[PDB]
Amino acid sequence: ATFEIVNRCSYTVWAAASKGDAALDAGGRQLNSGESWTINVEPGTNGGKIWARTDCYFDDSGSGICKTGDCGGLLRCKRFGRPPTTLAEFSLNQYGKDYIDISNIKGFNVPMNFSPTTRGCRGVRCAADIVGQCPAKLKAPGGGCNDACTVFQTSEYCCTTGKCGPTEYSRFFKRLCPDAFSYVLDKPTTVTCPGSSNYRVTFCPTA
Secondary structure, three states, X not given: OEEEEEEOOOOOEEEEEEOOOOEEEEEEEEEOOOOEEEEEOOOOOOOEEEEEEEEEEEOOOOEEEEEEOOOOOEOOOOOOOOOOOOEEEEEEEEOOEEEEEXXXXXXXXXXXXXXXXXXXXXXXXXXXXXXXXXXXXXXXXXXXXXOHHHHHOOHHHHOOOOOOOOOHHHXXXXXXXXXXXXXXXXXXXXXXXXXXXXXXXXXXXXX
């Protein structure tokens, strides 16, 4: 599948695409305000994620640090990023269909729109001012709004036992972004798209 990854933000982002134990396509790249990066993700990829990283520094070997979404200090991500990260998530070619959602389960850094560029389904968007409105106990000093699991490390926020319900903190995310996952076991906002559909992830889609 082809993913076009566009930075509509007024600031630089370092985009990332991983499936957790490997990079997707090249894994990461600096995206300046208005730049677009087109990647190819191998069909049948299960549990892929794309995200933005903010306030970053790399050296000439591609090694450094990101204030949000750091994936072990690498420009070219192989592993998932450090919360807070708004997440575009996808499983492709799963019994003939692709699956796409947006998630706030690992917090929120940048507003995003995940939209397929080919026919047969709808996109989703989480573009409210979450970091401005963020509860004080969640607000990250590095920038962004953490998920409760990250901050409080409880069975209830982390859904450790597979039984958990909504919370003051999940409901905050849900109220501002109804079409994004707010906790591990939310009513699903997954969209089913025809297998081998293509897509565009846009950071700061309204601004």
